Structure 1
């Protein structure tokens, strides 16, 4: 079937000129709403959630891991490094790198998480360990953002990412103090006010991770606490046909507003 909500998302998509993917899980009743839910999209910086979560999982068996220093050298800086550049020729802890990656979208910080995990495939391995058969991380920053149409590298589907985000933030994929830390980090994101959360009633609270890349790729994944009811998980991915396209955070806000109005 095609619901009214799905038809509205298709109208939004048509007007946008791009390709929109949406997955909602309403934890009040476990129901899902999806739009292109099984199509692949480039994750861009939304993949930082999986990497940070994989390090949190490692920390369950190493109480001091998050306080472990990692050297930041000039050669490690990539294209967007607002926290790591302050620490070149010094160190950041794995907690500091996780916070920087998640809350500031620091790409050097992501590369240090990836390295801690043994490379992109270590991120994918953690995904598989928590039941996500779809996610794949193939490259480091910045090349994981090339976002070329039809390229499977560094992609997932909206359905898979919503399910994973639920398990990580609300379920039991992580230990309870690690889950709480992930949620704290997401709720302190600095980059999200124009994306999903722009489409939601302002009384609601949320944590999110944005992403952006080539092909005007504009993404957000969020855990949401609406006023008065059980939490939601919402994924909104968007990508466009030309390599140089502009970001469209407003499309993500519009998708979220359609979802919220449909509850």
Structure 2
């Protein structure tokens, strides 16, 4: 954590914003922590926890995941790359969950939020697994304003990492649901230039990205399975002071590398 404190401070000076990282080695329990308790906008990264919340309630409602959902043109928000293709047919809850995780589909996300009782419902789920930091307040795309100092629709890298470990590796989800959750994340298509880019080919990895765009705000959280040791869980979030500041996928990848090197690769 101190082996990387000055490399991190330099990386974020080159970026021109702020970088929050929390990484945990599930074996030794070693952690690496940089701005890990600061709040960062979640952007689309709430969609992973959305799917986990849906999986949780499929433990009470049999057939939830295969329930068909029908929706109108008015449900199609900018960047709905999957749900726009099934507008005239509809989609199952599992297909919408997969779309939200693997393509960061915004209409799918908002449809799933409705089923859960909106942002308060998802926040309620996160409280039930012991996360007191997470808050979702708004819908796509309003949630992505990324205003400096605004606590709405934020969490911390450490809370994100801790909740992810509970849902992917711990006991927050029953074992069928937990494996489904992990599979959706492993099939994510939007994270090739972020945490995955810090990861060698022979490692298994599931992630979920977030890209507010404004205020140089983007993120990525991931469970990483090295060959021959325990999985690593980590979260990398960024933000920047000016609305037109650009986010950097390379900066996220670079913080992921520093976190893995900090834990002992």
**Fold agreement, TM-score > 0.5:** yes
- Whole-Å separation in 1 of the counterparts to 2:133 and 2:66: 31
Residue 247 of structure 1 and its aligned partner are, at CA, apart by 2.6
Paired residues for 1:1-12 under 5 Å? 3-12=2-11
Q: Which residue of 2 aligns with 1:252?
A: 252
Q: Which residue of 1 aligns with 2:74?
A: 75
Paired residues for 1:116-135 under 5 Å? 116-135=115-134
Paired residues for 1:84-233 under 5 Å? 84-213=83-212, 214-233=214-233
- 2:136–2:154 contact (8 Å) kept in structure 1: yes
- 1:72–1:87 contact (8 Å) kept in structure 2: no
Q: Which runs of 5+ in 2 are unaligned?
A: none
Residue 32 of structure 1 and its aligned partner are, at CA, apart by 1.5
- 1:216–1:243 contact (8 Å) kept in structure 2: yes
Residue 88 of structure 1 and its aligned partner are, at CA, apart by 1.6
Q: Determine helix, strand or coil for the equivalent of 1:254.
A: helix
Which piece of structure 1 moves more, 193-202 or 97-106?
Answer: 193-202
Paired residues for 1:47-58 under 5 Å? 47-58=46-57
Measured against aligned partners, the alpha-carbon deviations of 1:135-169 in whole angstroms (never above 9, x if no partner) come to: 00000100111111100000000110100000000
Measured against aligned partners, the alpha-carbon deviations of 1:190-246 in whole angstroms (never above 9, x if no partner) come to: 111100111123322200000000212110000000121100001000111221222
Measured against aligned partners, the alpha-carbon deviations of 1:56-80 in whole angstroms (never above 9, x if no partner) come to: 0010011200011111210001111
Q: Determine helix, strand or coil for the equivalent of 1:65.
A: coil
Q: Determine helix, strand or coil for the equivalent of 1:90.
A: coil
- Whole-Å separation in 2 of the counterparts to 1:201 and 1:68: 38
- 2:21–2:259 contact (8 Å) kept in structure 1: no
TM-score, with length taken from structure 1: 0.97
Q: Which runs of 5+ in 1 are unaligned?
A: none
Measured against aligned partners, the alpha-carbon deviations of 1:73-124 in whole angstroms (never above 9, x if no partner) come to: 1000111100010122431111000000000110111101100101110000
Q: Which residue of 2 aligns with 1:45?
A: 44
Residue 31 of structure 1 and its aligned partner are, at CA, apart by 2.1
